[PDB]
């Protein structure tokens, strides 16, 4: 369907949502690393 | 950079950047992370 261009309009919304979710996940990971560097979260809690 | 070091951790080796031939260590204690003489405390008096 994407190849023939039928569902590009419908799929764009889900594609953007997935991209935003992935960016949020990356930002959360970097935020957790920065939190460790600051010290607010211990190494044991970071693994969890 | 950004590493948590405990007391007694090895930091590095001494250099001779100031006076070649004789090695020394420039040791300075501050209350801020600046680069000037405004906020400097004598290390010997501080550790005393
Ligand atoms: Zn000096």
How many alpha or pi helices of chain A? 2
Percent in helix of chain A: over 70%
The proportion of residues in beta strands of chain A is: under 5%
Helix and strand pattern of chain A: HH
Shape of chain A: rod-shaped
What's the oligomerization state? part of a larger assembly
Distinct small molecules? zinc ion
Beta strand count of chain A: 0
**How many angstroms separate the termini of chain A?**
41 Å
| Biggest sheet layout of chain A | none
PDB class: viral protein
Keywords: Cyanophage, Virus, viral protein
Entry title: Cyanophage A4 pre-ejectosome
Chains A, B: Internal protein
How is the topology of this model organized?
The structure is cut from a larger assembly and holds two copies of chain A (48 residues).
Chain A: H1 8-38, H2 43-47
Summarize the structure in words.
The structure is cut from a larger assembly and holds 2 copies of chain A (48 residues). By secondary structure, the first copy, chain A, is mainly α. Chain A is built from 2 helices and no strands. The first copy, chain A, has helices at residues 8-38, 43-47. The termini of chain A are far apart. The chains hardly touch. Chain B: This is Internal protein. Chain B: It comes from Anabaena phage A-4L.
Which descriptors apply to this entry?
2 chains; 2 helices; Internal protein (chain B); 48 residues; binds zinc ion; part of a larger assembly
Short description:
It is classed as viral protein. Keywords: Cyanophage, Ejectosome. The structure is cut from a larger assembly and holds two copies of chain A (48 residues). Chain A is mostly helical and 48 residues long.
């Amino acid at each position: 369907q994407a190849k023939h261009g039928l569902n590009v309009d419908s799929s764009y919304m889900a594609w953007e949502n997935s991209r935003k979710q992935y960016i949020e996940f990356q930002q959360q990971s970097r935020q957790l690393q920065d939190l460790e560097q600051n010290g607010l979260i211990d190494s044991a809690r970071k693994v969890n | 950079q950004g590493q948590r070091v405990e007391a007694g951790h090895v930091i590095g080796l001494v250099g001779d950047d100031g006076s070649p031939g004789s090695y020394h260590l420039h040791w300075e204690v501050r209350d801020n992370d600046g680069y000037g003489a405004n906020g400097t405390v004598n290390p010997l008096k501080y550790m005393g």
